[PDB]
Design a protein around this ligand. Structure first.
Ligand SMILES: NCC(=O)NC[C@H]1O[C@@H](n2c(C#CCN(CC(=O)O)C[C@H]3O[C@@H](n4cnc5c(N)ncnc54)[C@H](O)[C@@H]3O)nc3c(N)ncnc32)[C@H](O)[C@@H]1O
Ligand SMILES: NCC(=O)NC[C@H]1O[C@@H](n2c(C#CCN(CC(=O)O)C[C@H]3O[C@@H](n4cnc5c(N)ncnc54)[C@H](O)[C@@H]3O)nc3c(N)ncnc32)[C@H](O)[C@@H]1O
Ligand SMILES: NCC(=O)NC[C@H]1O[C@@H](n2c(C#CCN(CC(=O)O)C[C@H]3O[C@@H](n4cnc5c(N)ncnc54)[C@H](O)[C@@H]3O)nc3c(N)ncnc32)[C@H](O)[C@@H]1O
Ligand SMILES: NCC(=O)NC[C@H]1O[C@@H](n2c(C#CCN(CC(=O)O)C[C@H]3O[C@@H](n4cnc5c(N)ncnc54)[C@H](O)[C@@H]3O)nc3c(N)ncnc32)[C@H](O)[C@@H]1O
Lengths: 264, 264, 264, 264
């Protein structure tokens, strides 16, 4: 139906996009970047994340597809050589959609109410604004720990192969509706203690970070990173919303992991 | 109904057991260690694991309860001081059961067929029988990696706070039906590569370990450790069977984790 | 001889300082904070680091002593209760000095020459100024790796129990004239590789960090953190300079470590 | 002078050995495997370790050289293609020797005195004989920790790229006269605490492991692994003895590390 194509913007990706637009012109496919039904990302995983956040208000009406023009992007399940086969199978349709869970981040501020919510496909992280980073971690209203260190990272399942992995987190198959919290350089001695281990939470569990001294934090959501001031609370939970991928052939997650980290 | 009580066997635990037997005698409670309906473990987590494996053929007909006479056992949710309240609330009943997932281990041998299956509440591990440990890891029939190192550990959710934790694994809430694979001292250089990260698998995923040279392995299931010879394959999957706990009050998993590792 | 006392500035530390000044008044001790010969720090390890950097141009003419008014500071080897014994043994003298190695950091800039050097007692770290952090690591003019991640930390021996420890670094006895490099959340996949392991360098080895794209970095030296622009190179080596401590009794490093992390 | 050549024993290494023997026959070189002065190892690092232990009573009278017939052995600094250049430069001599530190392991037994000492080029490790592994760690007669876990590894500097590396240890340049202790899967909770971090000790420091319950341990020294019974103490210290290598060209340790783990 309606489709759109976002491009990394280098010469290689722009030309692939133009050629795919020409190929779609031979079918009942209409280019519309306002309310598309298929969103094709041509570039890398960064390009795909921007595509996701470009259309995160219409997630349930869109199936995403990624083409990697550089090396294998984790959200890319297509090489540029297969772009014509992509046009054709997409044109005919009859594909099946797969859904990965997402992370909801709520940021509460002081001096009254006011709230901001964000959706993450990889992760959301919290760091301080220059000084020391100290937050109380509250799990389902239960005070769990006082964290002192560089920061905290909350990952989706498909995010576990990204920042989460570099922090020592586990890789979880994206059929598991969960989120995973990992530490960044916690201090542990006689007076300061954190769990250390990554923590994996199911749906409906709420993880709340609460300031202890400084109330300014650098908060990231995927690629976006903003300094938030007068923060009262940061709440993490598995979103009710999901991202849908258009799948045309079997490419299992664990094979995707193998290709990306073991050999290809 | 029918109940039984297993004891660590020290003076403290035997006397608590005898006193609980006397208290149960004042109700319609019948001691039967053949087909009990409630199994009470008095001791530590080792005592509770033995209780579980003592009755693993009647898991769906039994609710387990643990009393820790030493420090807080992770499967113990009762102190000895509360044993009388335990007798009474157990006597009246009306409690609710909670269920944790279990791990199925299948060991296939050569020189014909023959198979052995085991159930694990904490984990199952594989090490070599003296020489180097080398196995191919196959996930859902897909060759994932060739592991060279000291061994591998596959953990249940409630097991993730045990051996899994010491190996760098994530802690997962036991409502998640999953199993987690962690490495023991893998070698990684120009010629040998493993994923490194712990891996978390959902139900219905099968992880198969396959010998490369030596076919003898030391295989553990919770406390039991046996040398298996002429092994053709070791298969891991989340069991369809579950362990049921009798719960009388709220004691959340993450509070249990906090009490055991942060402070109490 | 000449001495001075720096204070954390809370009520507890200021009063201890005034009382020690009064006690020193009963001996041939002269207060001089311009060219002191003994520098006493009253507070925590942060207070001691400021004391060190206050007098880092006269390191070879000064013996440092730390009193911890809070919990045991790692550079503090005296409790407040022993302050009078400190005055007296310091007054009589005859103590012996011990020396720990230091880290030299040289920052070279572009648009001409120009250089800045800094001395570190704990560590020096490098992070990016917002964007991705990518540096080439060059050891004794040999290209070792291209690091992609959050940053790098170079620690002195006595620094290894601080930030270095939280990053997974080894603890090294301060009689070893060395420096230790640890990674902060490196990315490792098919295209990006770092060593992962902490690296320990002897004297006369030079570790050079060289920019790949962005040339702006946040560089810390102990507590001081500055954004450096137009950076051409960051060079690390074990300093020829050393910090001298006044020692009055045996308090071994490994006992100091035990008291700080195991139990006290 | 006198030389000998040990071979991995595969067809490739035996033939290289025979060809080198023929080449040495054209010089004043005499084959003697009783009191050689040059020991050439042809194979892998395992072959080189056997060569070292074959002649560990004449370490100060021997210079070692390694040829790797498989991939780059860490103690191999020669490819098979350069074997003739090796013969010739060795024949002429005038090379310079380099020395790496070694680890001394002393095992004391009960039921009287009796002692066994061993020399290690890579490491010495301690594990239990089946049951739980619990030892008290005593550093220079100071009780440091009670270790509960899978075992402990004490590495030389050149050993730090081997088992030590897989356990999270730091890589240290072999000019540093030190040894490094790393944990194997320590348990850490409310009642059990270890340092966690690897520990690096200078010369003259003594690390003593002392049994708590079971007195039987599996003790390894490089490739050799023996069950020791009635053990009273295991003592580690940097040896006064050193291994000498014959060096013909510059091949820096950090380049050796880069070639072995980053790329080649
Ligand atoms: N200049 C492009 C670049 O090299 N970026 C990151 C690399 O990671 C890969 N990757 C991404 C991605 C992405 C896009 N980037 C950049 C952009 O959006 O511009 C934002 C993400 O950065 C991650 N990240 C940040 N810091 C670190 C760190 N220290 N260590 C590891 N990852 C880190 C966070 O998670 C961000 O979400 N998602 C996944 C995934 N799901 N699975 C597996 N791999 C993934 C990319 O293919 C690429 O190889
Ligand atoms: N002598 C008793 C002893 O100290 N044993 C182990 C300790 O671990 C606790 N623990 C147990 C348990 C248990 C019983 N034991 C002994 C027995 O059965 O005799 C078998 C298990 O050993 C574990 N284990 C083996 N090696 C290591 C290691 N290197 N590091 C960490 N744990 C290790 C494995 O997982 C076995 O299943 N299950 C859990 C859990 N679910 N959550 C949190 N904590 C748990 C116990 O309270 C106790 O503190
Ligand atoms: N508000 C005071 C505070 O809690 N600060 C840090 C804590 O660490 C201890 N500590 C210090 C110190 C110090 C002073 N601070 C503060 C100041 O100067 O204001 C600067 C240093 O911060 C360290 N640091 C930074 N980020 C992290 C992190 N993520 N994880 C661990 N440590 C971190 C760096 O290395 C800095 O040098 N040097 C050592 C040492 N040698 N041995 C053992 N312990 C040490 C202090 O007793 C204190 O418990
Ligand atoms: N079948 C041969 C094999 O693959 N063996 C080990 C591999 O490690 C390399 N290696 C060796 C070596 C060696 C010889 N072997 C075998 C033999 O002697 O037969 C004994 C050593 O095993 C190590 N080892 C044991 N367990 C583990 C483990 N879990 N993880 C990592 N290493 C482990 C210990 O340290 C032993 O000393 N010393 C070093 C070094 N200095 N630097 C860097 N790399 C080194 C070898 O090139 C080889 O690639």
């Amino acid at each position: 139906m309606k489709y759109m194509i976002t491009s990394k913007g280098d010469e290689k990706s722009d030309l692939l996009r133009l050629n795919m637009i020409a190929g779609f012109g031979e079918y009942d496919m209409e280019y519309d970047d306002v309310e598309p039904e298929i969103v094709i990302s041509i570039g890398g995983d960064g390009t795909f994340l921007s595509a996701f956040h470009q259309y995160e208000e219409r997630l349930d009406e869109i199936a995403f597809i990624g083409i990697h023009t550089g090396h294998l992007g984790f959200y890319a399940d297509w090489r540029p050589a297969e772009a014509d086969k992509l046009v054709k199978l997409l044109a005919k349709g009859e594909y099946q959609k797969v859904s990965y869970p997402l992370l909801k981040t709520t940021v509460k501020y002081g001096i009254g109410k006011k709230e901001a919510t964000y959706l993450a496909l990889n992760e959301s992280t919290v760091k301080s604004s220059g000084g020391p980073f100290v937050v109380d971690v509250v799990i389902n209203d239960i005070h769990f720990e006082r964290f002192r260190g560089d920061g905290l990272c909350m990952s989706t399942p498909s995010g576990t192969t990204a920042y989460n992995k570099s922090l020592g987190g586990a890789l979880m198959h994206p059929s598991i509706e969960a989120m995973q919290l990992t530490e960044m350089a916690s201090i542990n001695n006689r007076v300061y203690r954190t769990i250390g281990s990554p923590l994996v939470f199911p749906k409906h569990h709420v993880v709340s970070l609460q300031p202890v001294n400084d109330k300014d934090f650098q908060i990231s959501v995927d690629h976006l990173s903003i300094l938030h001031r007068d923060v009262q609370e940061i709440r993490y939970e598995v979103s009710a919303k999901k991202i849908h991928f258009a799948r045309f052939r079997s490419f299992p997650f664990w094979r995707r992991v193998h290709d990306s980290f073991i050999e290809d």
